[PDB]
Amino acid sequence: SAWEKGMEAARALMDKYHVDNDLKANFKLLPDQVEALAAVCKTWLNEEHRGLQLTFTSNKTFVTMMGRFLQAYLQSFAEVTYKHHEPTGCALWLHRCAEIEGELKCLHGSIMINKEHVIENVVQISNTDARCCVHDAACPANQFSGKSCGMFFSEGAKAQVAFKQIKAFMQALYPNAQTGHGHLLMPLRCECNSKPGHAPFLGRQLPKLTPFALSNAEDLDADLISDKSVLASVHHPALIVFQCCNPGGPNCDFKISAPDLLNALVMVRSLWSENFTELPRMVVPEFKWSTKHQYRNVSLPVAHSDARQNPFDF
Ligand SMILES: [Zn+2]
Ligand SMILES: [Zn+2]
Fold first, then answer.
1. Which of 6, 26, 65, 130 has its CA 20 to 30 A from that of 154?
2. Which domains does the chain possess?
């Protein structure tokens, strides 16, 4: 059986990396069973990469993600699969966000509309470079629609840097490669929508894409360096950071940067290679827009105080 083939591999890794006997014991190739895999990733990491540096991500998240990556390899190699149970929990977004200067596109594949954020002594916060989902060009300041991809940006330029960063970061890693480093390896689910059979929840249905500034302290050095991977963040002091779907209802502490995310994948490939002869062909789904992703907003009409007793005049 394929299952057995999977069990064999999973088992090797597990004994070799001394995973808690309990985990081992209660392990089948069940889709929801990622723990056991994370532990493998956890110990190995340790042993072969202690003091790993993570930019804007948490350890749980990283290991966890490594866990899914393992799970995919495991599954592919064994040739087992579970319908509606994609392992990686990520997709490949062909963001055409670094093609036109000052131009960003949202998940819809549509260019993001620019809109200023003021409208009102007071404490007026201005956002002249904000960008929104075409389907939100009508909504008030940062309120998402029922068609929105839930993708918003308060600082277009920033966000473009981050996108540029990832691109340059990937080029660094993969200089010669028949493919335009236009894809963005992004997670489609966080802790909240981790399981297919999950309590539907309002708001953003995908992890939030948020660019974090690096500059802050990073602009305090540059010229010495030679390492392409380093140069990238330096020429583009901003990173793409994915958090919870909604950082009301549920909320998780999911946090991982694009690079750390791409690094978790790479790292799983090495771990696999240090244990298995050949690396199986692992396919991260291409991102395709769908309703499944549409922002779930609840729209309720709100009352307004009228100093009147009765609604109308007669
Ligand atoms: Zn959109
Ligand atoms: Zn979440």
1. 65
2. 1-88+259-285 (1.10.269.10), 89-258 (3.90.148.10)
